[PDB]
Amino acid sequence: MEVDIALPTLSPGDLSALQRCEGRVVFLETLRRHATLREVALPCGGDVLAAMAAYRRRFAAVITRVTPHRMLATPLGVGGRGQSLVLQNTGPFDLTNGDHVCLVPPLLGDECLRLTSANLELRFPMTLPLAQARELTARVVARAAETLRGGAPARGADVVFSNGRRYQLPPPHRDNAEAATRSLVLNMIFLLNEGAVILLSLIPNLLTLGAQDGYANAVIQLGSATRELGQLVRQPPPPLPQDHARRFCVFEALEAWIASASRLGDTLGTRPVARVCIFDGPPTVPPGEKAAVVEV
Amino acid sequence: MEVDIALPTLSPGDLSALQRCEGRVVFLETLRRHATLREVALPCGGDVLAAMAAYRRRFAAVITRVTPHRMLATPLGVGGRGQSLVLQNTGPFDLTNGDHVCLVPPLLGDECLRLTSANLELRFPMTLPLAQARELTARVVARAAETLQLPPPHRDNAEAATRSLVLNMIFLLNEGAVILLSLIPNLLTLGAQDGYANAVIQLGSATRELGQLVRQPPPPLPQDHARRFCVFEALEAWIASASRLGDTLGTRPVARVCIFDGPPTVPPGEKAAVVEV
Amino acid sequence: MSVQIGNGLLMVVAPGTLTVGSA
Amino acid sequence: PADQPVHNYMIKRLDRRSLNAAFSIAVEALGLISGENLDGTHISSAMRL
Amino acid sequence: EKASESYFMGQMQVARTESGGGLHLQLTQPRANVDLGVGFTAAYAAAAL
């Protein structure tokens, strides 16, 4: 399977700048034999939450040779037996051999190919190993959160080690707006707060137990068989008659939180899409150049 | 590989009935090459939560052809991530190109293919898109958690699901969690100065009814707060635990629909191509 | 005097994937 | 003063379209057409036809 | 008009792929066009309603 893209009449010179991107991954809409560059495109600056959510409603595909007529592309998900392909790394740090890769939008200082000729912009996602990708987003949001409450100016924790060369985590509000990732921060902090609230409302005495014995015994007997102190969870008081503006049904809130937490936890990437199987080359690929990979 | 499900002799009044099931999925117990129809056979309606809990130990297989002698199948996922196959949309909702699919036991009963020729019957599960299977499993576990188109639970397996839920919930609370909890007023005061912030907070969010009833002091500093920092570990934990919540409650999706030619939407009760993930 | 018409045969058995799936 | 005769040049770029159509064939009917699964009977010949 | 359009047909070709069990043959044909006249050479009227 292979699809090209109808490449509009851009310009001299700038086409030779697009040609520098022969390994980036772009998201189509549906698998046809003919697409258009008009649609495989996003605003150079947009929220990361809705972009991360849209990355699922679409298909992935990499960019093979680009030609003045058109550029060809091969999809990742669909296929057979897992053919090989090239994947230009773009991340902040290199990716080692024998591992997995994930696709997250550019949370850090944004990059985008400003096609000024035909007035449109392309925004390619990042390529990170799973281990560090599960926690880079956490770094971003933990920074944002500690900035929220007006705490200590800094601590010296905006660094990530990877293959020795410690990254610096460029400062916020430099390349993007602070609002580029604020929706992610809100939607992730509020959900955990709501989860803790609903839990403590179900089990009121959880925190007044022994600071080292009652809590540990409770968990060890819960994870084990069905002691459960009969009904360990407490009985909730009756609710309001649904016309009083202060009705609060605990279990409705529980359903809402379960659903929303599922919806989040899905649209977070953290699922391998490809796996590096380099051969006859340098052992690890620094950021900026291409690498051989097999889809998963 | 192709699982070969054998058949006894049957009257033609029901062979033509079984023949119209060419794209529904079954659940084996072992991946032997040969298998008899009696192995893949569930009782009639009952224990929706228990049944769902059963789909997570055995592995599925969709059938592809029905001859009057044998019945072919295909092990769903053991060795293929691109095995293009077909399965028919046997749920109430039509599904569009792009989204995955998840298996769920049927509701209301009455979706049981009784074959009197051997006194057996099957229960083919319906196929829902994820954005709805999540809501369904959420509603069901939340309702069954209350008993400490609506069928009732059985109380012999509800407690197991409540344990599975409350366990993931309790392990979320850590030293970092209280720091994040210490700003609920500082969050609500923000969710009133811009639009999207007010939007991201739901209405009955059970936390607008906390910042308006309870005040909390500055958080106590943890042990060794000059070297480590709790919030980042807490958020890493939260991400790791939320990324696998639907697994422990519902089931992981198995395939996403792909269509090259036909219209995107495939209405209920009609075959549709797919590629497995 | 040793390379690629049996190392010919050898690499590009490649442009054959259907060997169709249909009777 | 009079206006000298005017000369002007203009070019038009091409427009690119495409046409396509599907031809999907079944899963039980090509190896009767490929003769692989053909067995020698007076019944399978009619099915290949 | 007599010739209000210039039209080029490329060369037909097949691209085929397995899915839905059977085979899925996909015909394509690249084709291009560009107007061949200064000023407008076509118009409509919107007669009825």
CA of C16 vs chain D CAs: smallest distance (Å): 15
Q: Does A6 touch chain D (CB under 8 A)?
A: yes
**What are the backbone dihedrals phi and psi of residue E15, each rounded to the nearest 5 degrees, phi first?**
-135, 120
Is the Cβ pair A33, D20 closer than 8 Å?
Answer: yes
Strand order in the sheet with A274-276: A84-86, A292-295, A274-276, A100-104, A126-129
Report the first-to-last Cα separation within chain D, whole angstroms: 86
Which residues, other chains included, contact A143 with Cβ-Cβ below 8 Å and sequence gap of 6+? A158, A169, A172
> Which tokens belong to B125?
């599960």
Return the exposure string of B139-156: e unless at least 16 CB atoms fall within 10 Å of the residue's CB, then b: ebbbbbbeebeeeebeee
Q: For chain A, give the DSSP string.
A: --EEEE-----TTTHHHHTT-SS-EEE-SS--SEEETTTS---SS--HHHHHHHTTSS-EEEEEEE-SSEEEEEESSS-SS--EEE----SSS-B-SS-EEEEE---SS---EEETTTTEEE---EEEEHHHHHHHHHHHHHHHHHHHTT--S--S---B-SSS--B--PPSSSSS-GGGSHHHHHHHHHHHHHHHHHHHHH-GGGTTS-TTTHHHHHHHHHHSSS-TTTT-SPPPPP---SSSTT---HHHHHHHHHHHHHHHHHTT--S--EEE---SS-SSB-TTS--EEEE-
Q: For C1-23, give the DSSP string.
A: ---SSHHHHHHH--S---S-S--
β-pairing, B70-75 vs B60-66, is antiparallel
Is the Cβ pair B238, A188 closer than 8 Å?
Answer: yes
CB A145 within 8 A of CB B234: no
**How many CA atoms does the CB half-sphere of A210 hold within 13 Å?**
7
Amino acid sitting at position A69 = H
What does the alpha-carbon distance between residue B91 and residue B268 come to, in Å, rounded to a whole number? 6
Considering only CB atoms, E34 lies closest to which of D13, D21, D27, namely: D13
- Residue A88 pairs in a beta bridge with none
Return the exposure string of A82-111: e unless at least 16 CB atoms fall within 10 Å of the residue's CB, then b: beebebbbbbbbbbeeeebbbbbbbbbebe
Closest CA to B122 of B106, B133, B108: B106
DSSP E6: E
Closest CA to A4 of A55, A69, A49: A69
CA of A38 vs chain D CAs: smallest distance (Å): 14
In a mutational test of the D interface, the residue from E29, E36, E38, E40 whose CB has the highest number of chain D CBs within 10 Å is E29
With contacts defined as CB-CB under 8 Å, which chain E residues touch D12?
34-35
With contacts defined as CB-CB under 8 Å, which chain D residues touch C23?
27-32, 34, 36-37
Which residues, other chains included, contact C12 with Cβ-Cβ below 8 Å and sequence gap of 6+? none
Tally Cβ neighbours within 10 Å of residue D39. 8
> SS3 of B186, please?
helix
- Residue B121 pairs in a beta bridge with B114
Closest CA to B106 of B128, B86, B139: B128
DSSP B124: P
Q: Does B230 touch chain A (CB under 8 A)?
A: no
Considering only CB atoms, E24 lies closest to which of D10, D19, D22, namely: D22
What angle, rounded to 10 degrees, do the helices at B130-144 and A250-266 form?
150
CB A166 within 8 A of CB A98: no
Is the Cβ pair E26, A1 closer than 8 Å?
Answer: no
CA of B204 vs chain A CAs: smallest distance (Å): 7
Is the Cβ pair C22, E16 closer than 8 Å?
Answer: no
Cα A223 to Cα A79, A114, A201, B168, B238, distances in angstroms: 42, 54, 20, 10, 19
Which technique was the structure solved with, according to the deposited record? Answer: cryo-EM
Q: Does D36 touch chain E (CB under 8 A)?
A: no
**Resolution reached, in Å?**
4.5
Question: Which other chains touch chain C, taking contact as 3+ CB pairs less than 8 Å apart?
Answer: D, E
What is the Cα Rg of chain C in Å? 13
**How many CB pairs lie under 8 A apart between chains A and B?**
196
What does the alpha-carbon distance between residue B129 and residue B269 come to, in Å, rounded to a whole number? 14
**What are the backbone dihedrals phi and psi of residue A257, each rounded to the nearest 5 degrees, phi first?**
-70, -40
Closest CA to B177 of A145, A247, A111, A69: A145
**Region class of E28: left (phi > 0), else alpha (psi between -120 and 50), else beta:** beta
Report the first-to-last Cα separation within chain A, whole angstroms: 16
> Which tokens belong to B273?
């191509």
> Which tokens belong to A185?
């921060």
Closest CA to A123 of A57, A32, A31, A52: A52
What does the alpha-carbon distance between residue B253 and residue B242 come to, in Å, rounded to a whole number? 16
- Residue B73 pairs in a beta bridge with B63
Closest CA to A261 of A219, A199, A211: A199
Which residues, other chains included, contact E39 with Cβ-Cβ below 8 Å and sequence gap of 6+? none
Cα B13 to Cα A148, B18, B117, distances in angstroms: 70, 10, 9
DSSP B220: P
What angle, rounded to 10 degrees, do the helices at B130-144 and B158-170 form?
110
Which residues, other chains included, contact A171 with Cβ-Cβ below 8 Å and sequence gap of 6+? none
Q: How would you class A24 by CB atoms within 10 Å of its CB: exposed for 0-12, middle for 13-18, buried for 19 or more?
A: middle
What does the alpha-carbon distance between residue E18 and residue B272 come to, in Å, rounded to a whole number? 14
Closest CA to A4 of E13, E7, C12: E13
**How many CB pairs lie under 8 A apart between chains D and E?**
53
β-pairing, A34-36 vs A3-6, is parallel
Tally Cβ neighbours within 10 Å of residue A3. 18
Tally Cβ neighbours within 10 Å of residue A291. 22
CB B266 within 8 A of CB B272: yes
Closest residue in C to D31 (Cα–Cα): C23
CA B132 to chain centre: 9
Tally Cβ neighbours within 10 Å of residue A191. 21
Amino acid sitting at position A250 = V
CA of D9 vs chain E CAs: smallest distance (Å): 11
What angle, rounded to 10 degrees, do the helices at B230-242 and A130-148 form?
130
Q: SS3 letters for chain D?
A: CCCCCCCCCCCCCCEEEEEEEECCECCCCHHHHCCCCCCCCCCHHHHHC
DSSP H or E segment with residue E18 = strand E13-18
Q: Does D20 touch chain B (CB under 8 A)?
A: no
**What are the backbone dihedrals phi and psi of residue B262, each rounded to the nearest 5 degrees, phi first?**
-70, 175
What does the alpha-carbon distance between residue A154 and residue A54 come to, in Å, rounded to a whole number? 34
Percentages helix, strand, coil for chain B (3-state, rounded to 5) are 30, 20, 55
Handedness of CA A216, A222, A224, A225 (dihedral sign): positive
> SS3 of B262, please?
coil
CA of A31 vs chain D CAs: smallest distance (Å): 13
CB B110 within 8 A of CB B84: no
CA B88 to chain centre: 18
DSSP H or E segment with residue B272 = strand B271-276
> SS3 of E41, please?
coil
CA B210 to chain centre: 32
With contacts defined as CB-CB under 8 Å, which chain A residues touch E17?
1
What does the alpha-carbon distance between residue B65 and residue B2 come to, in Å, rounded to a whole number? 11
- Residue-level length of chain E: 49
- Residue B122 pairs in a beta bridge with B113
Q: Does D19 touch chain A (CB under 8 A)?
A: no
Amino acid sitting at position B251 = T
What angle, rounded to 10 degrees, do the helices at B158-170 and A214-223 form?
140
> Tokens 């010739």 map to which residue?
E3
Which residues, other chains included, contact B226 with Cβ-Cβ below 8 Å and sequence gap of 6+? none
CB A55 within 8 A of CB A25: no
> Tokens 């397996």 map to which residue?
B157
DSSP H or E segment with residue B86 = strand B85-88
DSSP E2: T
> SS3 of B103, please?
strand
What does the alpha-carbon distance between residue A231 and residue A229 come to, in Å, rounded to a whole number? 6
Q: Does D8 touch chain E (CB under 8 A)?
A: no
